[PDB]
């Protein structure tokens, strides 16, 4: 058994939207709407398939037009914020001076706008970090992954800083080598 999902959304008034394929919980790819290019989740996907990126933009335009209609039809009933659960963990078990990856997993939230900051020793880090788009869930909330490659040291301490309209204050998630 398997499931493939083409998932797309438009959000107002932010005017943000995404287009992505999901296989059993994993992103196959999404489209970069500005550059109009297909962005494969793993480089090697891109050598065994292709996708007409422009099509996504067309779809997004339909999505937007329909949103606008639904907004009025609902008589401007706004979405209810649902704050996320956040979880920090490592790619593999940690051994000092062995390069690892810290994972910030933001889950069970909507709408799809978040702010995520990596905090080493209370200071923002951006070196080598990466993230995913908003991934789909059956209850229609969202998942998102942030990644921070690092060298495990004993002095270094870490935090994942997450903000979202459903939260009254930034949510900090700690992690140290203990």
């Amino acid at each position: 058994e398997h499931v493939i999902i083409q998932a797309e959304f438009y959000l107002n008034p932010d005017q943000s939207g995404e287009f992505m394929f999901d296989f059993d919980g994993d992103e196959i790819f999404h489209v970069d709407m500005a550059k109009k290019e297909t962005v494969w989740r793993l480089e090697e996907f891109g050598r065994f398939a292709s996708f007409e990126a422009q099509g996504a933009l067309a779809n997004i335009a339909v999505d937007k037009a329909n949103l606008e209609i639904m907004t009025k039809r609902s008589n401007y009933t706004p979405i209810t914020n649902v704050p996320p659960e956040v979880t920090v963990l490592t790619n593999s078990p940690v051994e000092l001076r062995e390069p690892n990856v810290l994972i910030c997993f933001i889950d069970k939230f909507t709408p799809p706008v978040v702010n995520v900051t990596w905090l080493r020793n209370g200071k923002p880090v951006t070196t080598g970090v990466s993230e995913t788009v908003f991934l789909p869930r059956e209850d229609h909330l969202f998942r998102k992954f942030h990644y921070l490659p690092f060298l495990p040291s004993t002095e270094d301490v870490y935090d994942c800083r997450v903000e979202h309209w459903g939260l009254d204050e930034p949510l900090l998630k700690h992690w140290e080598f203990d």
Binding site: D26, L67, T71, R73, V113, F145
Partner: protein
């Protein structure tokens, strides 16, 4: 986090569900406003259906366009099955071998870590001297990394004693013979 302006959200999902590969296919087009599904097209049903009141108009309006309903009904072949074929090679048949490691913790606890594997179907077992320990075993359950690999932690609560060999054993489609890691008092 400012800007309390009310938000309005529209989500489209096309879900291709596969059973025994291409054998049975179901297509689900779900339309969702502010996290509530309002109307869908279920290939098992063959036409749009309202899920909430808000969706009623679209069901009728789209159903009345019979040339489109046919496009949709075909989609299980033109879209679901077509796509399955294109992706199988690197998705359905993706195999990455787990990496296994053992180490103690306290609460004494033993920890088996299985990380970096795909797909997610996996069997992890604890052995005390080659007698499988079926009780006192506590698992973290599958964890999706978001990068097409999984990880999981299976803990054995036990009071070790030298002359006891603890084994963590892992079975997974990526390997033919189980992987085993042993830890000694």
């Amino acid at each position: 986090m400012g800007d309390t302006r009310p938000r309005f959200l529209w989500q489209l999902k096309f879900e291709c569900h596969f059973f025994n590969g291409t054998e049975r296919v179901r297509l689900l087009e779900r339309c969702i406003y502010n996290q509530e599904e309002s109307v869908r097209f279920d290939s098992d049903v063959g036409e749009y259906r309202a899920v909430t009141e808000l969706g009623r108009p679209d069901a009728e309006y789209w159903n009345s366009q019979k040339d489109l309903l046919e496009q949709r009904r075909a989609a299980v072949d033109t879209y679901c099955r077509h796509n399955y074929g294109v992706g199988e090679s690197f998705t359905v048949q993706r195999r990455v071998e787990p990496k296994v490691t053992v180490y103690p913790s306290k609460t004494n606890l033993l920890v088996c870590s299985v990380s970096g594997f795909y797909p997610g179907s996996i069997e992890v077992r604890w052995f005390r001297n080659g007698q499988e320990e079926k009780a006192g075993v506590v698992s973290t359950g599958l964890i999706q990394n978001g990068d097409w690999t999984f990880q999981t932690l299976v803990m054995l609560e036990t009071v070790p004693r030298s002359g006891e060999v603890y084994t963590c054993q892992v079975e997974h489609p990526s390997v033919t013979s189980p992987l085993t890691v042993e830890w000694r008092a």
